[PDB]
mmCIF file of C-alpha atoms and ligand atoms in Angstrom:
data_model
loop_
_atom_site.group_PDB
_atom_site.id
_atom_site.type_symbol
_atom_site.label_atom_id
_atom_site.label_comp_id
_atom_site.label_asym_id
_atom_site.label_seq_id
_atom_site.Cartn_x
_atom_site.Cartn_y
_atom_site.Cartn_z
ATOM 1 C CA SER A 87 8.874 -4.893 21.488
ATOM 2 C CA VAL A 88 6.409 -3.337 18.709
ATOM 3 C CA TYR A 89 4.049 -3.468 21.414
ATOM 4 C CA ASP A 90 5.789 -0.688 23.350
ATOM 5 C CA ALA A 91 6.925 1.555 20.971
ATOM 6 C CA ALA A 92 3.116 1.393 19.624
ATOM 7 C CA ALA A 93 2.387 2.828 22.941
ATOM 8 C CA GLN A 94 4.951 5.500 22.543
ATOM 9 C CA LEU A 95 2.571 7.129 20.272
ATOM 10 C CA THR A 96 0.958 9.687 22.692
ATOM 11 C CA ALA A 97 -2.196 12.202 22.270
ATOM 12 C CA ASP A 98 0.647 14.694 21.080
ATOM 13 C CA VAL A 99 2.812 12.969 18.969
ATOM 14 C CA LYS A 100 -0.857 11.302 16.818
ATOM 15 C CA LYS A 101 -1.686 15.370 16.333
ATOM 16 C CA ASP A 102 1.602 16.132 15.034
ATOM 17 C CA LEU A 103 1.694 13.092 12.340
ATOM 18 C CA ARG A 104 -1.621 13.405 11.723
ATOM 19 C CA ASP A 105 -1.263 17.729 11.004
ATOM 20 C CA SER A 106 1.795 17.568 9.405
ATOM 21 C CA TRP A 107 0.220 13.781 6.937
ATOM 22 C CA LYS A 108 -3.114 16.578 5.851
ATOM 23 C CA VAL A 109 -0.109 18.659 4.233
ATOM 24 C CA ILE A 110 2.888 16.023 2.899
ATOM 25 C CA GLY A 111 -0.196 13.340 2.219
ATOM 26 C CA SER A 112 -1.803 15.707 -0.716
ATOM 27 C CA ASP A 113 1.072 15.281 -2.334
ATOM 28 C CA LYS A 114 2.114 11.284 -2.778
ATOM 29 C CA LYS A 115 3.793 11.470 -5.986
ATOM 30 C CA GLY A 116 5.859 14.762 -5.772
ATOM 31 C CA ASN A 117 6.980 14.279 -1.506
ATOM 32 C CA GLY A 118 7.557 10.216 -2.570
ATOM 33 C CA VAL A 119 9.727 10.799 -4.747
ATOM 34 C CA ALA A 120 11.410 13.496 -2.609
ATOM 35 C CA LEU A 121 12.108 11.412 -0.334
ATOM 36 C CA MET A 122 13.518 8.354 -2.173
ATOM 37 C CA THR A 123 15.940 10.582 -4.177
ATOM 38 C CA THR A 124 17.122 12.087 -0.892
ATOM 39 C CA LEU A 125 17.395 9.089 0.522
ATOM 40 C CA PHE A 126 19.839 7.946 -2.089
ATOM 41 C CA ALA A 127 21.845 11.206 -1.724
ATOM 42 C CA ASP A 128 22.314 11.210 1.094
ATOM 43 C CA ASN A 129 23.215 7.425 1.728
ATOM 44 C CA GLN A 130 24.401 5.902 -1.567
ATOM 45 C CA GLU A 131 25.548 3.427 0.081
ATOM 46 C CA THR A 132 21.399 2.430 0.340
ATOM 47 C CA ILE A 133 20.963 1.978 -4.086
ATOM 48 C CA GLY A 134 22.352 -1.221 -3.895
ATOM 49 C CA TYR A 135 18.948 -2.812 -2.289
ATOM 50 C CA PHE A 136 16.784 -0.766 -5.112
ATOM 51 C CA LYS A 137 18.515 -2.678 -8.312
ATOM 52 C CA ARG A 138 14.712 -3.636 -9.312
ATOM 53 C CA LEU A 139 14.348 0.431 -10.105
ATOM 54 C CA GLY A 140 16.676 0.871 -12.579
ATOM 55 C CA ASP A 141 18.866 3.763 -12.753
ATOM 56 C CA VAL A 142 17.376 6.407 -9.364
ATOM 57 C CA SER A 143 19.452 9.153 -10.629
ATOM 58 C CA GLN A 144 16.504 9.626 -13.460
ATOM 59 C CA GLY A 145 13.863 10.447 -10.131
ATOM 60 C CA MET A 146 10.572 11.021 -11.708
ATOM 61 C CA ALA A 147 11.389 10.611 -15.089
ATOM 62 C CA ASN A 148 12.128 6.049 -13.674
ATOM 63 C CA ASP A 149 8.713 4.903 -13.959
ATOM 64 C CA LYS A 150 9.833 2.111 -11.262
ATOM 65 C CA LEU A 151 10.426 4.534 -9.039
ATOM 66 C CA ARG A 152 7.633 6.533 -9.042
ATOM 67 C CA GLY A 153 5.688 3.723 -9.011
ATOM 68 C CA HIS A 154 7.441 2.675 -5.561
ATOM 69 C CA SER A 155 7.803 5.807 -4.262
ATOM 70 C CA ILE A 156 3.606 7.022 -4.410
ATOM 71 C CA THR A 157 2.945 3.407 -2.668
ATOM 72 C CA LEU A 158 5.745 3.915 -0.417
ATOM 73 C CA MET A 159 2.880 6.775 0.352
ATOM 74 C CA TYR A 160 0.579 4.466 1.162
ATOM 75 C CA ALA A 161 1.947 2.229 3.493
ATOM 76 C CA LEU A 162 2.244 6.015 5.071
ATOM 77 C CA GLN A 163 -1.696 7.089 4.423
ATOM 78 C CA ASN A 164 -2.188 3.281 6.307
ATOM 79 C CA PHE A 165 0.317 3.922 9.397
ATOM 80 C CA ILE A 166 -1.736 7.258 9.758
ATOM 81 C CA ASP A 167 -4.983 5.810 9.913
ATOM 82 C CA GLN A 168 -4.518 2.767 12.071
ATOM 83 C CA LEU A 169 -3.520 5.435 14.871
ATOM 84 C CA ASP A 170 -6.870 4.856 16.739
ATOM 85 C CA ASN A 171 -5.841 0.773 17.206
ATOM 86 C CA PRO A 172 -3.050 -0.361 18.307
ATOM 87 C CA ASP A 173 -3.322 -3.859 17.959
ATOM 88 C CA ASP A 174 -4.236 -3.106 13.721
ATOM 89 C CA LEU A 175 -1.218 -0.527 13.850
ATOM 90 C CA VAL A 176 1.335 -3.650 15.082
ATOM 91 C CA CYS A 177 -0.218 -5.833 12.006
ATOM 92 C CA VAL A 178 0.132 -3.340 8.914
ATOM 93 C CA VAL A 179 3.358 -2.582 10.548
ATOM 94 C CA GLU A 180 4.409 -6.788 11.056
ATOM 95 C CA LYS A 181 3.389 -6.614 7.596
ATOM 96 C CA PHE A 182 5.643 -4.394 6.173
ATOM 97 C CA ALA A 183 8.818 -5.069 8.405
ATOM 98 C CA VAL A 184 8.524 -8.341 6.007
ATOM 99 C CA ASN A 185 8.804 -6.664 3.216
ATOM 100 C CA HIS A 186 12.234 -5.218 4.551
ATOM 101 C CA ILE A 187 13.216 -8.260 6.553
ATOM 102 C CA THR A 188 12.832 -10.572 2.936
ATOM 103 C CA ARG A 189 15.555 -7.419 1.816
ATOM 104 C CA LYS A 190 17.741 -7.754 3.923
ATOM 105 C CA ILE A 191 17.375 -4.652 5.747
ATOM 106 C CA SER A 192 18.014 -3.954 9.942
ATOM 107 C CA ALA A 193 16.477 -1.728 12.475
ATOM 108 C CA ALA A 194 19.588 0.375 11.462
ATOM 109 C CA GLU A 195 19.779 0.749 8.190
ATOM 110 C CA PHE A 196 15.806 1.205 8.366
ATOM 111 C CA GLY A 197 16.590 3.974 10.657
ATOM 112 C CA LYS A 198 18.469 6.132 8.051
ATOM 113 C CA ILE A 199 15.038 6.724 6.476
ATOM 114 C CA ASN A 200 15.093 9.802 9.629
ATOM 115 C CA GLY A 201 17.064 12.425 8.004
ATOM 116 C CA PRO A 202 15.414 12.240 4.684
ATOM 117 C CA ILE A 203 12.052 12.721 6.350
ATOM 118 C CA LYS A 204 13.559 15.867 8.337
ATOM 119 C CA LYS A 205 14.736 17.416 4.526
ATOM 120 C CA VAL A 206 11.418 17.188 3.634
ATOM 121 C CA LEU A 207 8.801 17.736 6.870
ATOM 122 C CA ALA A 208 11.391 20.997 7.017
ATOM 123 C CA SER A 209 11.194 22.107 3.013
ATOM 124 C CA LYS A 210 7.375 22.359 4.073
ATOM 125 C CA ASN A 211 8.382 24.026 6.951
ATOM 126 C CA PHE A 212 7.612 21.676 9.716
ATOM 127 C CA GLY A 213 10.695 21.537 12.169
ATOM 128 C CA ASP A 214 11.852 19.174 14.333
ATOM 129 C CA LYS A 215 9.210 18.896 16.477
ATOM 130 C CA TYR A 216 7.051 17.190 13.433
ATOM 131 C CA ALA A 217 10.977 15.442 12.805
ATOM 132 C CA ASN A 218 10.826 13.588 15.473
ATOM 133 C CA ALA A 219 6.793 12.273 15.888
ATOM 134 C CA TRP A 220 7.892 10.854 12.325
ATOM 135 C CA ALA A 221 10.857 9.354 13.859
ATOM 136 C CA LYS A 222 8.717 7.428 16.924
ATOM 137 C CA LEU A 223 6.467 6.099 14.050
ATOM 138 C CA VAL A 224 9.693 4.793 12.337
ATOM 139 C CA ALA A 225 10.696 3.443 15.522
ATOM 140 C CA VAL A 226 7.226 1.077 16.021
ATOM 141 C CA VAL A 227 8.774 -0.473 12.071
ATOM 142 C CA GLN A 228 12.389 -0.869 13.691
ATOM 143 C CA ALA A 229 10.504 -2.738 16.685
ATOM 144 C CA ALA A 230 10.112 -5.118 14.568
ATOM 145 C CA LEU A 231 12.713 -5.375 12.217
ATOM 146 C CA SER B 237 -0.716 -2.721 -23.690
ATOM 147 C CA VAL B 238 -1.554 -1.955 -19.941
ATOM 148 C CA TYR B 239 -1.611 1.509 -21.465
ATOM 149 C CA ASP B 240 -4.708 0.889 -23.166
ATOM 150 C CA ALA B 241 -6.128 -0.983 -21.002
ATOM 151 C CA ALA B 242 -5.863 2.169 -18.302
ATOM 152 C CA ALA B 243 -6.796 4.868 -21.079
ATOM 153 C CA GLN B 244 -9.883 3.041 -22.036
ATOM 154 C CA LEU B 245 -11.369 3.507 -18.391
ATOM 155 C CA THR B 246 -14.126 5.764 -19.492
ATOM 156 C CA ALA B 247 -15.773 8.504 -17.425
ATOM 157 C CA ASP B 248 -18.422 6.537 -16.619
ATOM 158 C CA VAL B 249 -16.972 3.787 -15.163
ATOM 159 C CA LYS B 250 -14.563 5.605 -13.374
ATOM 160 C CA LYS B 251 -17.823 7.767 -11.563
ATOM 161 C CA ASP B 252 -18.997 4.182 -11.232
ATOM 162 C CA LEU B 253 -15.735 3.441 -9.344
ATOM 163 C CA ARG B 254 -15.500 6.110 -7.355
ATOM 164 C CA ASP B 255 -18.767 5.691 -5.914
ATOM 165 C CA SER B 256 -18.849 2.003 -4.766
ATOM 166 C CA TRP B 257 -15.368 2.969 -3.297
ATOM 167 C CA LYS B 258 -16.709 5.356 -0.669
ATOM 168 C CA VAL B 259 -18.845 2.863 0.251
ATOM 169 C CA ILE B 260 -16.467 0.167 0.471
ATOM 170 C CA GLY B 261 -13.270 1.697 1.204
ATOM 171 C CA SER B 262 -14.619 3.389 4.711
ATOM 172 C CA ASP B 263 -14.412 -0.146 6.191
ATOM 173 C CA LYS B 264 -10.907 -0.849 5.294
ATOM 174 C CA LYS B 265 -10.587 -3.333 7.607
ATOM 175 C CA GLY B 266 -13.841 -4.953 7.847
ATOM 176 C CA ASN B 267 -14.371 -5.387 4.113
ATOM 177 C CA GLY B 268 -10.969 -6.327 3.535
ATOM 178 C CA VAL B 269 -10.823 -9.591 5.555
ATOM 179 C CA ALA B 270 -14.650 -10.434 3.538
ATOM 180 C CA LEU B 271 -12.989 -10.091 0.526
ATOM 181 C CA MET B 272 -10.062 -12.340 1.305
ATOM 182 C CA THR B 273 -12.615 -14.660 3.332
ATOM 183 C CA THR B 274 -15.055 -15.381 0.313
ATOM 184 C CA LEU B 275 -12.096 -16.196 -1.580
ATOM 185 C CA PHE B 276 -10.724 -18.676 0.027
ATOM 186 C CA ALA B 277 -14.389 -19.847 0.256
ATOM 187 C CA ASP B 278 -15.251 -20.148 -3.041
ATOM 188 C CA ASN B 279 -12.099 -20.887 -3.985
ATOM 189 C CA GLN B 280 -10.444 -23.024 -1.872
ATOM 190 C CA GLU B 281 -7.678 -23.773 -4.475
ATOM 191 C CA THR B 282 -6.218 -20.724 -3.595
ATOM 192 C CA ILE B 283 -5.454 -21.209 0.099
ATOM 193 C CA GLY B 284 -2.420 -23.040 -0.757
ATOM 194 C CA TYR B 285 -0.838 -19.690 -2.171
ATOM 195 C CA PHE B 286 -0.870 -17.619 1.097
ATOM 196 C CA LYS B 287 1.072 -20.091 3.398
ATOM 197 C CA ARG B 288 2.629 -17.060 4.880
ATOM 198 C CA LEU B 289 -0.444 -15.996 6.755
ATOM 199 C CA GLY B 290 -0.681 -18.944 8.971
ATOM 200 C CA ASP B 291 -4.641 -20.596 9.217
ATOM 201 C CA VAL B 292 -6.569 -18.024 7.314
ATOM 202 C CA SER B 293 -9.859 -19.583 8.848
ATOM 203 C CA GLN B 294 -8.955 -17.659 11.988
ATOM 204 C CA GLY B 295 -9.811 -14.425 10.024
ATOM 205 C CA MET B 296 -10.310 -11.188 11.502
ATOM 206 C CA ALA B 297 -8.548 -12.975 14.897
ATOM 207 C CA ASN B 298 -5.664 -14.062 11.879
ATOM 208 C CA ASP B 299 -3.183 -10.604 12.848
ATOM 209 C CA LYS B 300 -1.199 -11.580 9.792
ATOM 210 C CA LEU B 301 -4.408 -12.431 7.542
ATOM 211 C CA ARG B 302 -6.071 -8.819 9.159
ATOM 212 C CA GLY B 303 -2.907 -6.918 8.577
ATOM 213 C CA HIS B 304 -2.725 -8.481 4.586
ATOM 214 C CA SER B 305 -6.000 -7.243 4.284
ATOM 215 C CA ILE B 306 -6.076 -4.250 5.748
ATOM 216 C CA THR B 307 -3.129 -3.691 3.052
ATOM 217 C CA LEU B 308 -4.809 -4.636 0.379
ATOM 218 C CA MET B 309 -7.568 -2.292 0.047
ATOM 219 C CA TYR B 310 -4.822 0.105 0.432
ATOM 220 C CA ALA B 311 -3.279 -0.631 -3.408
ATOM 221 C CA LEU B 312 -7.558 -0.329 -4.631
ATOM 222 C CA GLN B 313 -7.203 3.267 -2.599
ATOM 223 C CA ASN B 314 -3.794 3.996 -4.571
ATOM 224 C CA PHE B 315 -5.573 2.544 -7.760
ATOM 225 C CA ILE B 316 -9.333 4.831 -7.302
ATOM 226 C CA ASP B 317 -6.276 7.317 -6.784
ATOM 227 C CA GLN B 318 -4.382 7.564 -9.763
ATOM 228 C CA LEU B 319 -8.067 7.079 -12.266
ATOM 229 C CA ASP B 320 -7.142 10.366 -14.092
ATOM 230 C CA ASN B 321 -3.569 10.305 -14.796
ATOM 231 C CA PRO B 322 -3.327 6.952 -16.966
ATOM 232 C CA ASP B 323 1.014 6.981 -16.179
ATOM 233 C CA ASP B 324 0.217 6.936 -12.935
ATOM 234 C CA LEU B 325 -2.013 4.501 -12.892
ATOM 235 C CA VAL B 326 0.034 1.977 -15.403
ATOM 236 C CA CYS B 327 3.015 2.918 -13.090
ATOM 237 C CA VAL B 328 1.778 1.537 -9.566
ATOM 238 C CA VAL B 329 -0.159 -1.486 -11.716
ATOM 239 C CA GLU B 330 2.994 -2.999 -12.784
ATOM 240 C CA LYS B 331 4.118 -2.284 -9.186
ATOM 241 C CA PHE B 332 1.770 -4.300 -8.022
ATOM 242 C CA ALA B 333 1.622 -6.631 -11.308
ATOM 243 C CA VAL B 334 5.142 -7.277 -10.027
ATOM 244 C CA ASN B 335 4.088 -8.025 -6.484
ATOM 245 C CA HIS B 336 2.383 -11.332 -8.042
ATOM 246 C CA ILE B 337 4.004 -12.157 -10.980
ATOM 247 C CA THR B 338 7.029 -13.624 -8.178
ATOM 248 C CA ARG B 339 4.578 -14.997 -6.985
ATOM 249 C CA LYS B 340 3.755 -17.278 -10.019
ATOM 250 C CA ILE B 341 -0.118 -15.968 -10.518
ATOM 251 C CA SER B 342 -1.345 -15.595 -13.682
ATOM 252 C CA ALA B 343 -3.757 -13.189 -15.233
ATOM 253 C CA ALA B 344 -6.298 -16.022 -15.110
ATOM 254 C CA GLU B 345 -5.714 -16.429 -11.452
ATOM 255 C CA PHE B 346 -5.969 -13.187 -10.672
ATOM 256 C CA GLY B 347 -9.668 -12.835 -12.578
ATOM 257 C CA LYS B 348 -10.714 -15.331 -9.426
ATOM 258 C CA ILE B 349 -10.813 -12.050 -7.334
ATOM 259 C CA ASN B 350 -13.731 -10.480 -9.931
ATOM 260 C CA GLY B 351 -16.331 -13.515 -8.099
ATOM 261 C CA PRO B 352 -15.731 -11.996 -4.113
ATOM 262 C CA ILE B 353 -15.787 -8.339 -5.358
ATOM 263 C CA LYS B 354 -19.427 -8.722 -6.910
ATOM 264 C CA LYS B 355 -20.367 -10.759 -3.381
ATOM 265 C CA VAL B 356 -18.724 -8.002 -0.953
ATOM 266 C CA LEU B 357 -20.362 -5.200 -3.785
ATOM 267 C CA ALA B 358 -23.663 -6.864 -3.973
ATOM 268 C CA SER B 359 -23.663 -6.581 0.320
ATOM 269 C CA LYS B 360 -23.401 -3.045 0.422
ATOM 270 C CA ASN B 361 -26.263 -3.436 -2.281
ATOM 271 C CA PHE B 362 -24.213 -2.595 -5.595
ATOM 272 C CA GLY B 363 -25.125 -3.946 -8.149
ATOM 273 C CA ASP B 364 -24.148 -6.267 -11.835
ATOM 274 C CA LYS B 365 -22.868 -2.242 -13.380
ATOM 275 C CA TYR B 366 -20.617 -1.448 -10.487
ATOM 276 C CA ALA B 367 -19.285 -5.475 -10.865
ATOM 277 C CA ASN B 368 -19.126 -4.596 -14.122
ATOM 278 C CA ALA B 369 -16.640 -1.313 -13.410
ATOM 279 C CA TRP B 370 -14.209 -3.277 -11.031
ATOM 280 C CA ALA B 371 -13.592 -5.973 -13.447
ATOM 281 C CA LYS B 372 -12.401 -3.759 -15.836
ATOM 282 C CA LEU B 373 -9.799 -1.710 -13.238
ATOM 283 C CA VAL B 374 -8.903 -5.586 -12.410
ATOM 284 C CA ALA B 375 -8.310 -5.660 -16.237
ATOM 285 C CA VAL B 376 -5.802 -3.340 -16.380
ATOM 286 C CA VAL B 377 -3.593 -5.443 -13.436
ATOM 287 C CA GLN B 378 -4.141 -8.195 -15.723
ATOM 288 C CA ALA B 379 -2.511 -7.193 -18.735
ATOM 289 C CA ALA B 380 0.380 -6.345 -16.984
ATOM 290 C CA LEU B 381 0.458 -10.513 -16.562
HETATM 291 C C1 LIG C 112 9.139 5.336 5.841
HETATM 292 C C2 LIG C 112 9.900 4.106 5.721
HETATM 293 C C3 LIG C 112 9.641 3.306 4.615
HETATM 294 C C4 LIG C 112 8.568 2.751 3.995
HETATM 295 C C5 LIG C 112 6.754 3.141 4.760
HETATM 296 C C6 LIG C 112 8.714 1.867 2.827
HETATM 297 C C7 LIG C 112 7.975 1.244 2.413
HETATM 298 C C8 LIG C 112 8.482 0.348 1.620
HETATM 299 C C9 LIG C 112 6.897 -0.327 0.351
HETATM 300 C C10 LIG C 112 5.886 -0.560 0.802
HETATM 301 C C11 LIG C 112 7.711 -1.229 0.110
HETATM 302 C C12 LIG C 112 7.439 -2.098 -1.481
HETATM 303 C C13 LIG C 112 7.132 -3.410 -0.716
HETATM 304 C C14 LIG C 112 7.173 -5.144 -1.876
HETATM 305 O O1 LIG C 112 5.962 -4.169 -2.261
HETATM 306 O O2 LIG C 112 7.900 -5.811 -1.163
HETATM 307 C C15 LIG C 112 9.223 -1.331 -0.262
HETATM 308 C C16 LIG C 112 10.010 -2.263 -0.776
HETATM 309 C C17 LIG C 112 11.466 -1.703 -0.391
HETATM 310 N N1 LIG C 112 12.603 -1.306 0.742
HETATM 311 FE FE1 LIG C 112 11.206 0.337 1.544
HETATM 312 N N2 LIG C 112 10.342 1.113 3.251
HETATM 313 C C18 LIG C 112 10.720 2.160 3.641
HETATM 314 C C19 LIG C 112 11.885 2.323 4.210
HETATM 315 C C20 LIG C 112 13.348 1.454 3.932
HETATM 316 C C21 LIG C 112 14.443 2.208 3.385
HETATM 317 C C22 LIG C 112 15.156 3.405 4.741
HETATM 318 C C23 LIG C 112 15.036 1.184 3.199
HETATM 319 C C24 LIG C 112 16.164 0.735 2.815
HETATM 320 C C25 LIG C 112 17.380 1.337 3.683
HETATM 321 C C26 LIG C 112 14.171 0.305 2.241
HETATM 322 C C27 LIG C 112 14.257 -1.088 1.692
HETATM 323 C C28 LIG C 112 13.140 -1.248 0.561
HETATM 324 C C29 LIG C 112 13.915 -2.333 -0.219
HETATM 325 C C30 LIG C 112 15.288 -2.374 -0.614
HETATM 326 C C31 LIG C 112 12.294 -2.532 -1.196
HETATM 327 C C32 LIG C 112 12.418 -3.035 -2.360
HETATM 328 C C33 LIG C 112 12.204 -2.655 -3.317
HETATM 329 C C34 LIG C 112 12.109 -3.284 -4.870
HETATM 330 O O3 LIG C 112 12.878 -4.092 -5.351
HETATM 331 O O4 LIG C 112 10.644 -3.296 -5.451
HETATM 332 N N3 LIG C 112 13.615 0.862 2.845
HETATM 333 N N4 LIG C 112 9.409 -0.325 0.822
HETATM 334 C C1 LIG C 113 -8.283 -7.369 -5.609
HETATM 335 C C2 LIG C 113 -6.841 -7.689 -6.434
HETATM 336 C C3 LIG C 113 -5.919 -8.041 -5.513
HETATM 337 C C4 LIG C 113 -4.908 -6.775 -4.872
HETATM 338 C C5 LIG C 113 -5.039 -5.677 -4.331
HETATM 339 C C6 LIG C 113 -3.411 -7.923 -4.425
HETATM 340 C C7 LIG C 113 -2.831 -7.148 -3.692
HETATM 341 C C8 LIG C 113 -1.900 -7.016 -2.711
HETATM 342 C C9 LIG C 113 -1.007 -7.239 -1.646
HETATM 343 C C10 LIG C 113 -0.788 -5.182 -1.819
HETATM 344 C C11 LIG C 113 -0.129 -7.823 -1.725
HETATM 345 C C12 LIG C 113 1.136 -7.954 -1.012
HETATM 346 C C13 LIG C 113 2.696 -7.766 -1.654
HETATM 347 C C14 LIG C 113 3.916 -7.615 -0.810
HETATM 348 O O1 LIG C 113 4.167 -7.399 0.597
HETATM 349 O O2 LIG C 113 4.534 -8.422 -1.552
HETATM 350 C C15 LIG C 113 -0.770 -9.445 -1.826
HETATM 351 C C16 LIG C 113 -0.412 -10.394 -2.139
HETATM 352 C C17 LIG C 113 -0.187 -11.770 -2.706
HETATM 353 N N1 LIG C 113 -1.583 -11.693 -3.562
HETATM 354 FE FE1 LIG C 113 -2.610 -10.422 -3.943
HETATM 355 N N2 LIG C 113 -4.123 -8.826 -4.652
HETATM 356 C C18 LIG C 113 -4.576 -8.803 -5.408
HETATM 357 C C19 LIG C 113 -5.504 -10.077 -6.190
HETATM 358 C C20 LIG C 113 -4.538 -11.758 -6.018
HETATM 359 C C21 LIG C 113 -5.188 -13.161 -5.690
HETATM 360 C C22 LIG C 113 -6.868 -13.086 -6.940
HETATM 361 C C23 LIG C 113 -4.339 -13.799 -5.870
HETATM 362 C C24 LIG C 113 -4.045 -15.581 -6.017
HETATM 363 C C25 LIG C 113 -5.340 -15.890 -6.767
HETATM 364 C C26 LIG C 113 -3.049 -13.343 -5.131
HETATM 365 C C27 LIG C 113 -2.028 -13.664 -4.156
HETATM 366 C C28 LIG C 113 -1.029 -13.305 -3.640
HETATM 367 C C29 LIG C 113 -0.493 -13.538 -3.023
HETATM 368 C C30 LIG C 113 0.091 -15.511 -2.903
HETATM 369 C C31 LIG C 113 0.232 -12.906 -1.856
HETATM 370 C C32 LIG C 113 1.141 -13.358 -1.489
HETATM 371 C C33 LIG C 113 0.749 -13.077 0.641
HETATM 372 C C34 LIG C 113 2.078 -12.782 1.387
HETATM 373 O O3 LIG C 113 2.729 -14.245 1.211
HETATM 374 O O4 LIG C 113 2.091 -12.375 2.079
HETATM 375 N N3 LIG C 113 -3.551 -12.292 -5.207
HETATM 376 N N4 LIG C 113 -1.780 -9.211 -2.623
#
């Protein structure tokens, strides 16, 4: 249940999400591309889903990948901004879930983003505590897939 | 080209876009839904394109419409944030253009949003100068359609 998952976002979890986002969200282009390139490097089996973006190995040099990556960071910005109101968080999460259901992405495969998130956070000196908080947010999307 | 349309956005136009967005963008849920409801009220022929959202006459109560409307405002946020780097603006604009090209939305049809934009701006006392500034930003996306 997406509603039960959203209820898992306690005061402490919301605080950790906001605190780490202040840093990570300050460079959407840089960290967004870093997140995607890490996903492709660690889970090569997901590259097929991204055929529209072309040669993802080009990273920042690939205009489609850059546009996609920046936009992905605004979806996370959206989630963070809706933390105060569970009903609004749920409706935006369901909107993005549809974007992935149409691409045949399961909850299990969506969860593969947790590895990359932990690595990007770690590179900015945010440890397991923060990675776990972000995993709880990712779990809200998983509940809708 | 799209780059040409973007590179033409002057310092004054960017200033007007940012000043009006400071206000309109501060209430994404309220102004996003107002923008969509105004589009449906004045251009009823577009209602059919949004069949996925269900009964759009339900307004704020419609969770799918609310989720869509909030997300639309973050696409605008994205554009505003990329104003000083035409290369980044172009790649995000092309990304969103694809979202509309796949739905068979023409450049002329996309321009129908200018009426609702003018009205929403007017509700916050932003006049014709501001409506003209926004029409120039919309024109950047039209260059990609
Ligand atoms: C933090 C997690 C993630 C977020 C917030 C996210 C967000 C997004 C957004 C905003 C889009 C654009 C939607 C559209 O315009 O249609 C997108 C597209 C896509 N996402 Fe994700 N995504 C995430 C993780 C994943 C993962 C882990 C996979 C795959 C295992 C995935 C697969 C896709 C695919 C295939 C597309 C379509 C790309 C294209 O053809 O343009 N996403 N995602
Ligand atoms: C202010 C300009 C506009 C912006 C910011 C914009 C942005 C968006 C965004 C972010 C999406 C979601 C894309 C996706 O996830 O697949 C969307 C979907 C869509 N847009 Fe727009 N749009 C604009 C104007 C228009 C206009 C004028 C029309 C039609 C005359 C239009 C028709 C559509 C349709 C049919 C969808 C698909 C809705 C659905 O089934 O989920 N858009 N738009």
